[PDB]
Design a protein around this motif. Sequence first.
Motif, PDB file in Angstrom:
ATOM      1  N   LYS F  28     -29.534  75.029  55.598  1.00 33.76           N
ATOM      2  CA  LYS F  28     -29.586  73.634  55.186  1.00 33.76           C
ATOM      3  C   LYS F  28     -31.003  73.088  55.198  1.00 33.76           C
ATOM      4  O   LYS F  28     -31.447  72.491  54.213  1.00 33.76           O
ATOM      5  CB  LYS F  28     -28.691  72.788  56.103  1.00 33.76           C
ATOM      6  CG  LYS F  28     -28.680  73.261  57.547  1.00 33.76           C
ATOM      7  CD  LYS F  28     -27.901  72.312  58.437  1.00 33.76           C
ATOM      8  CE  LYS F  28     -27.910  72.786  59.881  1.00 33.76           C
ATOM      9  NZ  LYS F  28     -27.284  71.792  60.795  1.00 33.76           N
ATOM     10  N   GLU F  30     -34.967  73.236  54.808  1.00 35.76           N
ATOM     11  CA  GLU F  30     -35.882  74.024  53.992  1.00 35.76           C
ATOM     12  C   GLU F  30     -36.712  74.989  54.825  1.00 35.76           C
ATOM     13  O   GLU F  30     -37.269  75.945  54.270  1.00 35.76           O
ATOM     14  CB  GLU F  30     -36.810  73.100  53.199  1.00 35.76           C
ATOM     15  CG  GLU F  30     -37.742  72.255  54.065  1.00 35.76           C
ATOM     16  CD  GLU F  30     -39.041  72.966  54.404  1.00 35.76           C
ATOM     17  OE1 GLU F  30     -39.436  73.879  53.650  1.00 35.76           O
ATOM     18  OE2 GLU F  30     -39.660  72.617  55.431  1.00 35.76           O
ATOM     19  N   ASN F  31     -36.830  74.736  56.132  1.00 31.06           N
ATOM     20  CA  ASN F  31     -37.646  75.583  56.994  1.00 31.06           C
ATOM     21  C   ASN F  31     -37.221  77.039  56.888  1.00 31.06           C
ATOM     22  O   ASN F  31     -38.020  77.909  56.520  1.00 31.06           O
ATOM     23  CB  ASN F  31     -37.548  75.109  58.445  1.00 31.06           C
ATOM     24  CG  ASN F  31     -37.638  73.602  58.577  1.00 31.06           C
ATOM     25  OD1 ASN F  31     -38.621  72.989  58.163  1.00 31.06           O
ATOM     26  ND2 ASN F  31     -36.611  72.997  59.162  1.00 31.06           N
ATOM     27  N   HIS F  56     -38.033  67.037  44.982  1.00 31.94           N
ATOM     28  CA  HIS F  56     -39.096  66.474  44.164  1.00 31.94           C
ATOM     29  C   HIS F  56     -40.416  66.598  44.905  1.00 31.94           C
ATOM     30  O   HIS F  56     -40.518  66.190  46.065  1.00 31.94           O
ATOM     31  CB  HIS F  56     -38.832  65.009  43.819  1.00 31.94           C
ATOM     32  CG  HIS F  56     -39.958  64.362  43.078  1.00 31.94           C
ATOM     33  ND1 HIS F  56     -40.643  65.003  42.069  1.00 31.94           N
ATOM     34  CD2 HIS F  56     -40.531  63.142  43.207  1.00 31.94           C
ATOM     35  CE1 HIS F  56     -41.584  64.203  41.602  1.00 31.94           C
ATOM     36  NE2 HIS F  56     -41.537  63.068  42.275  1.00 31.94           N
ATOM     37  N   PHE F  57     -41.415  67.147  44.227  1.00 28.42           N
ATOM     38  CA  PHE F  57     -42.764  67.284  44.754  1.00 28.42           C
ATOM     39  C   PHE F  57     -43.648  67.766  43.618  1.00 28.42           C
ATOM     40  O   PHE F  57     -43.175  68.445  42.703  1.00 28.42           O
ATOM     41  CB  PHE F  57     -42.819  68.263  45.939  1.00 28.42           C
ATOM     42  CG  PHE F  57     -42.213  69.606  45.645  1.00 28.42           C
ATOM     43  CD1 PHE F  57     -42.978  70.613  45.084  1.00 28.42           C
ATOM     44  CD2 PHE F  57     -40.881  69.863  45.923  1.00 28.42           C
ATOM     45  CE1 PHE F  57     -42.431  71.848  44.803  1.00 28.42           C
ATOM     46  CE2 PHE F  57     -40.331  71.102  45.641  1.00 28.42           C
ATOM     47  CZ  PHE F  57     -41.106  72.093  45.083  1.00 28.42           C
ATOM     48  N   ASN F  58     -44.922  67.395  43.666  1.00 31.62           N
ATOM     49  CA  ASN F  58     -45.904  67.950  42.749  1.00 31.62           C
ATOM     50  C   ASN F  58     -46.973  68.679  43.558  1.00 31.62           C
ATOM     51  O   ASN F  58     -47.221  68.353  44.722  1.00 31.62           O
ATOM     52  CB  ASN F  58     -46.537  66.859  41.877  1.00 31.62           C
ATOM     53  CG  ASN F  58     -45.504  66.026  41.144  1.00 31.62           C
ATOM     54  OD1 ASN F  58     -44.426  66.503  40.795  1.00 31.62           O
ATOM     55  ND2 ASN F  58     -45.849  64.778  40.876  1.00 31.62           N
ATOM     56  N   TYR F  60     -50.729  71.473  43.264  1.00 34.21           N
ATOM     57  CA  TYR F  60     -51.863  71.980  42.496  1.00 34.21           C
ATOM     58  C   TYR F  60     -52.637  72.916  43.406  1.00 34.21           C
ATOM     59  O   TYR F  60     -53.338  72.457  44.313  1.00 34.21           O
ATOM     60  CB  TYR F  60     -52.730  70.822  42.011  1.00 34.21           C
ATOM     61  CG  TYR F  60     -54.006  71.175  41.284  1.00 34.21           C
ATOM     62  CD1 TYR F  60     -54.025  71.316  39.905  1.00 34.21           C
ATOM     63  CD2 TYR F  60     -55.202  71.321  41.974  1.00 34.21           C
ATOM     64  CE1 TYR F  60     -55.189  71.619  39.235  1.00 34.21           C
ATOM     65  CE2 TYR F  60     -56.372  71.625  41.313  1.00 34.21           C
ATOM     66  CZ  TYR F  60     -56.358  71.772  39.942  1.00 34.21           C
ATOM     67  OH  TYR F  60     -57.520  72.071  39.274  1.00 34.21           O
TER      68      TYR F  60
END
Lengths: 89, 109, 111, 95, 34, 84, 85
Positions: F28, F30-31, F56-58, F60
């Motif tokens: 459950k 993300e770790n 959601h994340f951006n 670079y």
Amino acid sequence: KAIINSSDMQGDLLQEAQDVIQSGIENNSAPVLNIEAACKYIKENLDKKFGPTWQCIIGEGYAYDVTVQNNTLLFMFYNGNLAVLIFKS
Amino acid sequence: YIKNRFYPSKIQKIIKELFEDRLKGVEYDPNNANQLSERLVLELREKIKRGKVPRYKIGVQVVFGEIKGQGLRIASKCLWDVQNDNYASYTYTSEKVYCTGIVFGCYFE
Amino acid sequence: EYISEEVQKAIDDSVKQVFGIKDDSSQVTITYNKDKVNLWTQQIIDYTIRGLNKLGKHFKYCVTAILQQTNHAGISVQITAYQDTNTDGSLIQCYEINDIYAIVSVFAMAV
Amino acid sequence: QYKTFMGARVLWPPECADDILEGAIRETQDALKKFEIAREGQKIAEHLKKYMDDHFDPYWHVFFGKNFGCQAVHNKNRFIYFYIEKTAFLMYQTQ
Amino acid sequence: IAELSEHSVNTERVGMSHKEGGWPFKKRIEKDTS
Amino acid sequence: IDMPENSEMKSMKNDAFSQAKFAVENYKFENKISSHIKKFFDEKYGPNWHCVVGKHFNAYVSYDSKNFIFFYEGQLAILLYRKG
Amino acid sequence: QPVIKNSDMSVEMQKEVEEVAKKAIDYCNTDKEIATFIKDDFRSRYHGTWHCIVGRNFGSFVTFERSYYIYLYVGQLAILLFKTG
């Protein structure tokens, strides 16, 4: 005696929704039945099956106004006069 | 009773920002080293004045010198009930000078 | 009413006067010796305490010394105590010449 | 108890250092005010970590949003944690 | 070479369900009103 | 809709999908998911990888050519790439 | 006469629920208008997304935020207010 009135979702989930409301009727089929227990069952089954944020509603005369995700809404009627709405949000 | 408390690293904040922006890579000129320390110690004290600790007493201390084939050891000991009082310490060393500051804090009672 | 900087100054006077030589050749004609290390530790400590009781300060001291043979093994020296804010404290010092890794640890307390 | 700072509510006292703090405490709202809007996502944290790597130490990690909270171990004294108008900002540097 | 570490991050989570029960009087005792 | 590429032969691209599909369902937080993916790929191919999971994340990043995979897995989004 | 049957909020937020419900009763005769009054009021005072159902013969199963839920009877109306988002 399922009489679908308003459909928005996919026909497979249609069939499973009918089967689940039926199974709820059999879980609570007696003059002592309450629509609330069948409602719990419908919502929890559709959670553990097609994901959470389901919502089951049963009655015959009422007026709802709810927000629903597309392709996740159903409303229908029974010859036994059971109007059943279900929707995901 | 300590509603507003002292933790080390906001004084550690102040002391870092102070060090870079004030030292700006100065060399160790003997005629003005002690007075350079005198200036920045009082500037640091002014900063801890807004450092938002009402009863925490502030034992400022600073070291400034030049590194030239020179090994050194600096250490302190802490001497208080760990629940309230605390300390802070920072080091800042360029190619030829080193300035390190420590700031105590003792909740008055 | 003291300064640990001067406490360290006294420790340095003691050690570098006992064994430290400015001209760095006798310090390796004096390498670590199994027979003489006992004399070394005892006399370092005795001369250091003589330097300390030269001081007329009413504070109470206690001392510890460590002598390591070689840098290959590695060591960690750490200090901790429980005393009074204003006057008490401690001191440490590391020391190296050619093949002797000396360490001194002193505690100073009030009363 | 999340004391006030001329930039924002900062957990006082924190676990970082003030050139980093003042830099972030000015740069977060400078970035958000100048030409940036809350509608865009991590093209904010992009410029934030870029600015941090430009001047300060190179290896930073930024996490901001409306619901998060972390334990971890990092470089000593490189922990910026501040709320601003109900928006938690967290930054830490790792060697 | 340089030293290392592991900043293992998380998210703090607050989630509990109750069962709404339909009607079965405003005053607990009906005899008082009757 | 978006599928950045990597080396041919489907040596790592076919691997990342099959691994992340187990990872997402197994946990459950993300770790464990991201750590599982990275820890596996470290043993499998490379000395140091980098993995991101989230809705959601951006991002670079710098990386090594043909070692940058990014895919919209279910409702989630999983990014991965080698670096170091 | 409000009758709380299942609430999650703090006592102050509950009091606000019943006060806003009383106002909606004083002003709007239609259940939809009452529910919109309550929902917009709470969504405005707090921030996020509230939803209010008003009925007389009604069961449901919904998820909701913690301490952000009430099921009650004001007069003789079933008010189910909650916060999701």
